[PDB]
Ligand binder design. Sequence first.
Ligand SMILES: C[N@@H+](Cc1ccnc(NC(=O)Nc2cccc3c2[C@@H]2CCCCN2C3=O)c1)Cc1cn(CCNC2=c3ccccc3=NC3CCCCC23)nn1
Ligand SMILES: C[N@@H+](Cc1ccnc(NC(=O)Nc2cccc3c2[C@@H]2CCCCN2C3=O)c1)Cc1cn(CCNC2=c3ccccc3=NC3CCCCC23)nn1
Ligand SMILES: *[C@@H]1O[C@H](CO)[C@@H](O)[C@H](O)[C@H]1NC(C)=O
Ligand SMILES: *[C@@H]1O[C@H](CO)[C@@H](O)[C@H](O)[C@H]1NC(C)=O
Ligand SMILES: *[C@@H]1O[C@H](CO)[C@@H](O)[C@H](O)[C@H]1NC(C)=O
Ligand SMILES: *[C@@H]1O[C@H](CO)[C@@H](O)[C@H](O)[C@H]1NC(C)=O
Ligand SMILES: *[C@@H]1O[C@H](CO)[C@@H](O)[C@H](O)[C@H]1NC(C)=O
Ligand SMILES: *[C@@H]1O[C@H](CO)[C@@H](O)[C@H](O)[C@H]1NC(C)=O
Ligand SMILES: [Cl-]
Ligand SMILES: [Cl-]
Ligand SMILES: [Cl-]
Ligand SMILES: [Cl-]
Ligand SMILES: [Cl-]
Ligand SMILES: [Cl-]
Ligand SMILES: [Cl-]
Ligand SMILES: [Cl-]
Ligand SMILES: [Cl-]
Ligand SMILES: [Cl-]
Ligand SMILES: [Cl-]
Ligand SMILES: [Cl-]
Ligand SMILES: [Cl-]
Lengths: 532, 532
Amino acid sequence: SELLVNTKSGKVMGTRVPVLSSHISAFLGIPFAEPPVGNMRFRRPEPKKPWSGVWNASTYPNNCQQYVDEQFPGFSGSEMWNPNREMSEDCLYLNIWVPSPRPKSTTVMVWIYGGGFYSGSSTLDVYNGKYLAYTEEVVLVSLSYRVGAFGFLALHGSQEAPGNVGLLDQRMALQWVHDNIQFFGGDPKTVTIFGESAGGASVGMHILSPGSRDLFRRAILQSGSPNCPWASVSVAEGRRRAVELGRNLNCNLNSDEELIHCLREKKPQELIDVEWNVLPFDSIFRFSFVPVIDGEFFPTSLESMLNSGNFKKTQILLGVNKDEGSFFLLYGAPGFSKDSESKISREDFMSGVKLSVPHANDLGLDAVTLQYTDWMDDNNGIKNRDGLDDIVGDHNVICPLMHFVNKYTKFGNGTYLYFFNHRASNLVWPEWMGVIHGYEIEFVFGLPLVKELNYTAEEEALSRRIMHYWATFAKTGNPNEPHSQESKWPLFTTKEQKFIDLNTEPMKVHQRLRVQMCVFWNQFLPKLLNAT
Amino acid sequence: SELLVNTKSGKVMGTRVPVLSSHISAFLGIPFAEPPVGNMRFRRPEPKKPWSGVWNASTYPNNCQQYVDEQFPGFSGSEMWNPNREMSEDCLYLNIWVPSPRPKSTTVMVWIYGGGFYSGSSTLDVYNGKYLAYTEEVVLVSLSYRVGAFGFLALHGSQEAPGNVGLLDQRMALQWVHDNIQFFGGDPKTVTIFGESAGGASVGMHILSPGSRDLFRRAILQSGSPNCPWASVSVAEGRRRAVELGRNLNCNLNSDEELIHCLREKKPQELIDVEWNVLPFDSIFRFSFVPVIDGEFFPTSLESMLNSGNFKKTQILLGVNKDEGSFFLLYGAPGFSKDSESKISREDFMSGVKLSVPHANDLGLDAVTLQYTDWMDDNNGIKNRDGLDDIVGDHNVICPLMHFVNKYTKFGNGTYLYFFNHRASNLVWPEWMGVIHGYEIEFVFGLPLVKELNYTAEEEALSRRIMHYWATFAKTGNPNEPHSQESKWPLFTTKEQKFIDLNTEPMKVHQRLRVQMCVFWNQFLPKLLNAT
Ligand SMILES: C[N@@H+](Cc1ccnc(NC(=O)Nc2cccc3c2[C@@H]2CCCCN2C3=O)c1)Cc1cn(CCNC2=c3ccccc3=NC3CCCCC23)nn1
Ligand SMILES: C[N@@H+](Cc1ccnc(NC(=O)Nc2cccc3c2[C@@H]2CCCCN2C3=O)c1)Cc1cn(CCNC2=c3ccccc3=NC3CCCCC23)nn1
Ligand SMILES: *[C@@H]1O[C@H](CO)[C@@H](O)[C@H](O)[C@H]1NC(C)=O
Ligand SMILES: *[C@@H]1O[C@H](CO)[C@@H](O)[C@H](O)[C@H]1NC(C)=O
Ligand SMILES: *[C@@H]1O[C@H](CO)[C@@H](O)[C@H](O)[C@H]1NC(C)=O
Ligand SMILES: *[C@@H]1O[C@H](CO)[C@@H](O)[C@H](O)[C@H]1NC(C)=O
Ligand SMILES: *[C@@H]1O[C@H](CO)[C@@H](O)[C@H](O)[C@H]1NC(C)=O
Ligand SMILES: *[C@@H]1O[C@H](CO)[C@@H](O)[C@H](O)[C@H]1NC(C)=O
Ligand SMILES: [Cl-]
Ligand SMILES: [Cl-]
Ligand SMILES: [Cl-]
Ligand SMILES: [Cl-]
Ligand SMILES: [Cl-]
Ligand SMILES: [Cl-]
Ligand SMILES: [Cl-]
Ligand SMILES: [Cl-]
Ligand SMILES: [Cl-]
Ligand SMILES: [Cl-]
Ligand SMILES: [Cl-]
Ligand SMILES: [Cl-]
Ligand SMILES: [Cl-]
């Protein structure tokens, strides 16, 4: 009765799951799209044709076709990110957690996973929405979208494989929530989208895309933003990559129509096996199939939209972690190791710089080297490691986000900036990697409230603060509660540029987050690469 | 009798001058060149024609024709550098200080005054050679040379105005000393040339010039070196300025002989009046008529000589002051006179960076600006002033010198490096100016030993240490006396790059003098400008 809901696409039968020492309602694996199989591969999503009967919505769905990481088999630190369900091109489903009893028009939070646009799943243990929905009494949605070539193969001009179809997937899950979340207790006019990494960049792209603005109220961006250097490509580069993929598979390259149907015949993992061979450089923190600046989803360049103010004006709550770069060096760089302190010689440092700014010329790599080398001590293995770490995070995550924060605040109505730098007490990774990319997610989603997972009671409190900041921001557009006595998180302003620390210690206010290095990455280095 | 010496050019008779509580011999205004007057203006010096009689060498000679500083009339801090004798083109004379009774073949130190190649005099109170000669029992010579257009008008190809004739003036005074110092008790085989600023750059140039190498033994360079950006010009740039000097005096410009003929009919002060108008840019720490890279005095470019080791191999002692750039900013950048101290606004800072690096394109100016700005605090008047202060010293003095000390030590037979950072307790300048360009000269020459000049007893001790380091180095090629128990000044080597501090505190040994900023000035910025 509570688990039997009559949507505009059919009836859905949920299930009563346990949370903490209570229960709530879960509606798992509801489809919002026609399965993009067959010659519907690479194509714009089509709305799910409505169904008679009762859709069984009591089990997690499939995960989309993606490259599976086998770097450290059996290791929980890395397997926690892999698909925990079967993979299938039939994967466009969403999950809904409803408090119990079902509320009356309560605040909706829609979660978009990251994973560099090539991986990701809605069904991961650390994206379990029961804790956040129960504690803050919000209705928690998590969607999905096609990743890799299946979601972002771009042959602009063709309508067979136009590009950005994985973003269009996310838009159709937002459109479904707009049309149906009211039947679950959710208020369609108070919906907050939020995601991390490629999901944070996705959030920002819906802020900018005109066809997406009317489908959500406000936005949270965690360690990602639409202007990141790994998040977009030109229609030329995306066409170069798509053609290069057909070459790798012996496809007819005479026309698109011939290329697209050649690729539609291959098995999904046939594409995945050659996915990485299309990248133009040797790189870390670069991914093959990503959104394109097509002129449709994005009417002009991202920067000219941020300049003119051509985007949704609302409130945003965003931030970054302390060591966004570390695990990307673990995986792709010389001298690092999961079971070692990972001191790195000057020769490996200059190699890492090359992998990390793969587009620069020699003048640019010299500039980057100069900015992060302590020439009084240039063979200090620790300083070289920490230095290259900061390079990856600053270039790929922090300084792109900071540039997005400064342009958005000009026209927006409320900006709340955070810096996350608590290292979880139970972390399975070596401590040289500090606060790792993606590792604030377990605090956002309430997992420190489970005694079984062996957090400290101060981490439970930190997790409860974050869940509240997030949910309160989702309801009111402001993460602080009026008339309380907890210290207030200040508005980031164009003039004072304030932000807070998120950790177990009392809240400190700082200003100008990593400004010295982001003037280099956002102002000086682009000028030097454009002039040479 | 002691005072009566028979040289290879004639007899000379000096005077018995008092030094502290004693006396020494002094031979003032001895000529070493035919007066470069009339049609000898701008032309290589000719050896003094030997005279009959007794040359009266008991008074200082004239100072060469030069631009006179009238920025702060009557103010000793600046007037102590101005000519204190009459100005005349008949100025090629040298001074000698000889201990009494006359030593037999003792060590000779030859002083070369600085002044940016446009000013300078051997006769200043601060170059009073009597103290160093008496205290260290050395024969102290100070030469002279033509400055400004009179010494460095370069019309390459012409033999009427070739260029570098002021460096040749210096060479002829060194040749005179090589031929005659033995008659005064000096050992022509133990000659040390030493100079500050343009003198230090001159000293380095004699190390480099094959025609000068056999005229001296070792070398001391103070706050100058030959590769400084203000110390040399191409034959083209030198030609462009020589012509533009004639254009300013409405001279014929159809040929070198008519340009030269025109400029020898103008009175000296005419040329001085127009001298500053031929600089290519608005600038500070740039001078109009400087040595030229001609292929005779310097067979190839300064860098190719250093890379290849084409220079005299011996021992050098060299160093810099803490605040080389301050007085160039006081004199030349407004903003340094809008404040009691000299807190400068951010807009004054960006303008100074333009007047300090007069050859950089806007990309180079952004690079300089970015390197010296604290973007957490960019409106700090003190940080802005101090920042541009270092820019002027690092670019013009410290980092040109460190490039020279590193290239030389690969091939040389011994390098000693110093950092002078004492502020005299009796300085007439404001405190923000620090340790000013040229204010170690008073310690080198023993002035703190005069009670009437009210230095502290700790500074008299510092001046005795300096004179000894200088004189011992002049005698043995090493400033330390071994057998001593006093702290030892270590060699600068290619690997450890050690240097010491000169002040009243006990000796400290550092490494890599200002290496972070000199990597910027000496490798990154030159290649930034090479590219654009
Ligand atoms: C960088 N990623 C790896 C990668 C793998 C394979 N290949 C490349 N790159 C290449 O270039 N490969 C390549 C491979 C073989 C041959 C060639 C080439 C290149 C291609 C170009 C031309 C030359 N090449 C070749 O011949 C990069 C890094 C990466 C991996 N995960 C998935 C794991 N999830 C995560 C984590 C994992 C650990 C810790 C924290 C994590 N937090 C997060 C938060 C966001 C969700 C995912 C996530 N996420 N990010
Ligand atoms: C650089 N000096 C100034 C200067 C004067 C005149 N003019 C320029 N520069 C220009 O650009 N002038 C200019 C003037 C008028 C019109 C135009 C232009 C420009 C020319 C370019 C095109 C456009 N312009 C014009 O239309 C610079 C600075 C300078 C001055 N002293 C002589 C003083 N002795 C010294 C000191 C003095 C005080 C403290 C420490 C000192 N320690 C030393 C140590 C070394 C011996 C000298 C010395 N030494 N250094
Ligand atoms: C829904 O699916 C699960 C397993 O796929 C099954 O055990 C459960 O009984 C189903 N519920 C129905 C058919 O009502
Ligand atoms: C947001 O917009 C409202 C409506 O114009 C305005 O009253 C409010 O002050 C704005 N807030 C911010 C932080 O810009
Ligand atoms: C948490 O700690 C308990 C007690 O030490 C242990 O039995 C359990 O296996 C731990 N859980 C995890 C997930 O490590
Ligand atoms: C040399 O000149 C000085 C200064 O005028 C004078 O006192 C001295 O008598 C002169 N010597 C001779 C021998 O004339
Ligand atoms: C200087 O040269 C001598 C003789 O050739 C040599 O033995 C000595 O080691 C050298 N010293 C330095 C410091 O280079
Ligand atoms: C030297 O210092 C003393 C004591 O401070 C002072 O009285 C004297 O007048 C000073 N001498 C000069 C020439 O300024
Ligand atoms: Cl094509
Ligand atoms: Cl298939
Ligand atoms: Cl080490
Ligand atoms: Cl760390
Ligand atoms: Cl604002
Ligand atoms: Cl005296
Ligand atoms: Cl000797
Ligand atoms: Cl000409
Ligand atoms: Cl002639
Ligand atoms: Cl005039
Ligand atoms: Cl200072
Ligand atoms: Cl005294
Ligand atoms: Cl020794």
